[PDB]
Design an enzyme around this catalytic site. Structure first.
Site, PDB file in Angstrom:
ATOM      1  NE  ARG A  56     -30.552  -3.389  35.850  1.00 28.62           N
ATOM      2  CZ  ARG A  56     -31.198  -2.165  35.926  1.00 28.62           C
ATOM      3  NH1 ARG A  56     -32.545  -1.982  36.221  1.00 28.62           N
ATOM      4  NH2 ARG A  56     -30.663  -1.074  35.343  1.00 28.62           N
ATOM      5  CG  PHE A  61     -36.421  -6.654  45.879  1.00 29.49           C
ATOM      6  CD1 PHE A  61     -35.278  -6.938  47.024  1.00 29.49           C
ATOM      7  CD2 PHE A  61     -37.586  -5.773  46.204  1.00 29.49           C
ATOM      8  CE1 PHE A  61     -35.448  -6.044  47.862  1.00 29.49           C
ATOM      9  CE2 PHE A  61     -37.323  -5.034  47.316  1.00 29.49           C
ATOM     10  CZ  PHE A  61     -36.363  -5.131  48.375  1.00 29.49           C
ATOM     11  CD  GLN A  64     -34.920  -5.497  34.467  1.00 29.64           C
ATOM     12  OE1 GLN A  64     -34.678  -5.077  35.506  1.00 29.64           O
ATOM     13  NE2 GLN A  64     -34.743  -4.725  33.364  1.00 29.64           N
ATOM     14  CG  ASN A 103     -41.787   0.500  31.944  1.00 26.76           C
ATOM     15  OD1 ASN A 103     -41.075   1.244  32.555  1.00 26.76           O
ATOM     16  ND2 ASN A 103     -42.926  -0.216  32.525  1.00 26.76           N
ATOM     17  CG  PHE A 114     -39.708  -7.622  36.799  1.00 21.74           C
ATOM     18  CD1 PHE A 114     -40.253  -6.594  35.760  1.00 21.74           C
ATOM     19  CD2 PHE A 114     -40.510  -7.725  37.921  1.00 21.74           C
ATOM     20  CE1 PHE A 114     -41.105  -5.900  36.192  1.00 21.74           C
ATOM     21  CE2 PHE A 114     -41.538  -7.023  38.127  1.00 21.74           C
ATOM     22  CZ  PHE A 114     -41.740  -5.923  37.369  1.00 21.74           C
ATOM     23  CG  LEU A 123     -42.409  -2.802  40.910  1.00 19.50           C
ATOM     24  CD1 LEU A 123     -41.579  -4.092  40.469  1.00 19.50           C
ATOM     25  CD2 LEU A 123     -41.379  -1.666  40.417  1.00 19.50           C
ATOM     26  CG  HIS A 127     -43.209  -2.212  35.782  1.00 21.31           C
ATOM     27  ND1 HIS A 127     -41.933  -1.990  35.191  1.00 21.31           N
ATOM     28  CD2 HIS A 127     -42.890  -1.157  37.096  1.00 21.31           C
ATOM     29  CE1 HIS A 127     -41.094  -1.134  36.032  1.00 21.31           C
ATOM     30  NE2 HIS A 127     -41.726  -0.662  36.789  1.00 21.31           N
TER      31      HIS A 127
END
Ligand SMILES: *CC(=O)N1CC(C(=O)N(C)[C@H](C(=O)N[C@H]2Cc3cc(O)cc(c3)-c3ccc4c(C#N)cn(c4c3)CC(C)(C)COC(=O)[C@@H]3CCCN(N3)C2=O)C(C)C)C1
Ligand SMILES: Nc1nc2c(ncn2[C@@H]2O[C@H](COP(=O)(O)OP(=O)(O)NP(=O)(O)O)[C@@H](O)[C@H]2O)c(=O)[nH]1
Ligand SMILES: [Mg+2]
Lengths: 166, 168
Positions: A56, A61, A64, A103, A114, A123, A127
């Site tokens: 990803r 952003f 990942q 996760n 990421f 987040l 995370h």
């Protein structure tokens, strides 16, 4: 005494070398999470990140990766024989370069991670942040050109090699 | 001319949003699970003798990514609210998606259909009566579906189009 470890990824794009990204791992604040990423980067337990892809990439952003066991971004495993607990939420997603755990809900850390390319405050507290890009943020920025709004990548972005420095 | 309908599929993780969409678009079902961020599809269909263009936005993210999902939902003209009959949490979550739709569309009257998916399964944790009562309390249709057998799939999407046409 032990200084925070430094690890590197050599990134490739459809098999062609792109460049090196290095990371400081905050073992001083999240030792168990840092150690997992360090050992997966060296491959010293017989499995780890080498050869895996960034499945990803979301421009603006994060990127990942870390799934070295499944084909659909659902895999990976930690060095602890099981998914492991969220160690702490001391550190926040403060800006580009932050390294944090992916996760599937509370206490489900495996190997996926990421790299933020922006501040991702929403987040925080879900995370575990455990490191930050040291050198090669320009390489992470170059990787973003191969992502899209929903994370699908237009070229295959791989960790061609990885290990520890210094 | 061909009217276009923007349909958005929402609901908790794993309920079958993508499997339902892929049955409509590609006429097959697989057991593999490929988690969604968002995917958009287009398909021409005939409904009640009229050729129509469906835009399907297949969403995800539950509560943690709900603020991002707002932006896709704001595009929609009608919504499928999907739960799975063996997933109590997914049924309890329907309220959240309903409230999100009303907020992002800024309206108390939005075309919607409640979808109870995985109706092929031999076991269930949510009563059909619960879903019928919930849909009635919202004033919307309730359709039982299985992406596996294709039960109810066309009916869910076509009913939603008819709901949009009645709203205009
Ligand atoms: C739904 C369910 O049961 N599961 C199990 C799957 C799962 O958790 N994984 C595959 C794990 C994982 O990748 N975790 C991931 C969180 C995440 C997973 C999935 O499948 C979707 C999304 C997040 C998601 C969905 C919608 C959405 C929108 C919208 N609209 C916006 N964003 C969404 C994310 C935010 C981003 C920036 C566009 C994408 O965000 C991510 O991809 C997110 C960033 C933080 C790290 N991270 N992914 C996760 O931890 C695996 C680790 C097993 C789904
Ligand atoms: N038995 C059965 N399984 C189904 C049905 N619909 C989906 N599944 C299965 O349930 C799993 C999840 O389906 P999927 O369509 O990916 O769910 P989703 O709601 O899109 N998940 P996400 O929110 O992560 O995108 C898959 O293994 C799929 O085969 C159904 O009607 N019956
Ligand atoms: Mg899906």
């Amino acid at each position: 005494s032990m200084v925070n470890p430094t690890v590197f990824f050599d990134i490739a794009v459809d098999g062609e070398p792109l460049g090196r990204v290095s990371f400081e791992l905050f073992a001083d604040k999240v030792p168990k999470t840092a150690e997992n990423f360090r050992a997966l980067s060296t491959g010293e337990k017989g499995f780890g990140y080498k050869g895996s892809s960034f499945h990803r990439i979301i421009p603006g952003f994060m990127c990942q990766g870390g799934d070295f066991t499944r084909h659909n971004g659902t895999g990976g495993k930690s060095i602890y024989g099981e998914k492991f607990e969220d160690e702490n939420f001391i550190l926040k997603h403060t800006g580009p370069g932050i390294l944090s755990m992916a996760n599937a809900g509370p206490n489900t850390n495996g190997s996926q991670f990421f790299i933020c390319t922006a501040k991702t405050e929403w987040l925080d507290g879900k995370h575990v942040v455990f490191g930050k890009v040291k050198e090669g943020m320009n390489i992470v920025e170059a990787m973003e050109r191969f992502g899209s709004r929903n994370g699908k990548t237009s070229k295959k972005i791989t960790i061609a090699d990885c290990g520890q420095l210094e | 001319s061909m009217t276009e309908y923007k349909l958005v599929v929402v609901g908790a993780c794993g309920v079958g949003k993508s499997a339902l969409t892929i049955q409509l678009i590609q006429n097959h079902f697989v057991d593999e699970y490929d988690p969604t961020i968002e995917d958009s599809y287009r398909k021409q269909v005939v409904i009640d003798g009229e050729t129509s263009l469906l835009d399907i936005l297949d969403t995800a993210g539950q509560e943690e990514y709900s603020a991002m999902r707002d932006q896709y939902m704001r595009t929609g003209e009608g919504f499928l609210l999907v739960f799975a009959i063996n997933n109590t949490k997914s049924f309890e979550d329907i309220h959240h998606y309903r409230e999100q739709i009303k907020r992002v569309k800024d309206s108390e009257d939005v075309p919607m259909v409640l979808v109870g998916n995985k109706s092929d399964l031999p076991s269930r944790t949510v009563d059909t009566k619960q879903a019928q009562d919930l849909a009635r309390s919202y004033g919307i249709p309730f359709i039982e579906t299985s992406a596996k057998t294709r039960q109810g799939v066309d009916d869910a999407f076509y009913t939603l189009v008819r709901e949009i046409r009645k709203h205009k």
